[PDB]
Structure 1
Amino acid sequence: MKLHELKPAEGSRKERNRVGRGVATGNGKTSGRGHKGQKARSGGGVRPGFEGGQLPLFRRLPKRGFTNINRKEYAIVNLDQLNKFEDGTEVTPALLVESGVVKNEKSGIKILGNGSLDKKLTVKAHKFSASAAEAIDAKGGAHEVI
């Protein structure tokens, strides 16, 4: 483009609505607010969740439960994200990270079995599910809980 012939992508820009600027716009005198009341006043909205005095919803339902501050949570790796490795490889937490399969390892890796393996590997992680460990030791190769 030249600097005197700029055009934006079609559909990307749009002009803002200006209210209270005459009758023909459609938003003139009362500016879209209707007639008198609490909602037509400056700074006049009522609080979100307020129901006019009827008991609000989040005070007639009971509280429930607690939160455990020592909760653990694992980085999940399913069984079909291991098909981008070659046979014989030693899949280790240091390798899943650099390979971009795990961004953040929270409490350690945990292997789950959701796809199909179709590879022969030796995997070493923190936790396995029954199906995952079973499916790894079906094409050969083993697993080692570290």
Structure 2
Amino acid sequence: FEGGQLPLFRRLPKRGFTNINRKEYAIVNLDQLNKFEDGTEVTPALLVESGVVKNEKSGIKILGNGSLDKKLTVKAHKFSASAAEAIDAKGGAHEVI
């Protein structure tokens, strides 16, 4: 309350809407995939069991932060472009599930 001066959240406009079907992904960066041994097959079950992902949400997405120094096979719902490039560059493979 501003004593009768029009309050701040009335002098400002409303903006936007909320998407009912908003999809939010659990995100794993490259630096978090470095805890697995070479040749590992990474899967949402393995990421959940290892403590990398607590809540899976709409699916797992791999992002490109950090350095990946281990060859892996990754099965995730989504990959960022740099994530795919750095997974394949290090000799590994990735699949979309």
**TM-score scaled by length of structure 1:** 0.65
Question: SS of 1:90's equivalent?
Answer: strand
Question: SS of 1:102's equivalent?
Answer: coil
Pick from 83, 97, 105: which aligns with 2:56? 105
Deviation at 1:112, TM superposition (A): 0.2
Partner Cα distance (2:34, 2:86) in 1: 13
Q: Deviations over 1:43-80 (max 9, x none)?
A: xxxxxxx1111111111111111111110000010000
Q: Deviations over 1:9-64 (max 9, x none)?
A: xxxxxxxxxxxxxxxxxxxxxxxxxxxxxxxxxxxxxxxxx111111111111111
Question: SS of 1:137's equivalent?
Answer: helix
Question: SS of 1:124's equivalent?
Answer: strand
Report the structure number with the largest CA radius of gyration: 1
Partner Cα distance (1:76, 1:140) in 2: 22
Q: Deviations over 1:73-115 (max 9, x none)?
A: 0001000001100011100110000000000000010000110
5+ long unaligned stretches in structure 2? none
More strand by share: 2
**TM-score scaled by length of structure 2:** 0.97
Deviation at 1:139, TM superposition (A): 1.3
Partner Cα distance (2:77, 2:29) in 1: 14
Partner Cα distance (2:8, 2:90) in 1: 55
Partner Cα distance (2:92, 2:15) in 1: 46
Give 1:36-47 correspondences, 5 Å limit: none
5+ long unaligned stretches in structure 1? 1-49
The structure whose RCO (Cα within 8 Å, separation 6+) is larger is 2
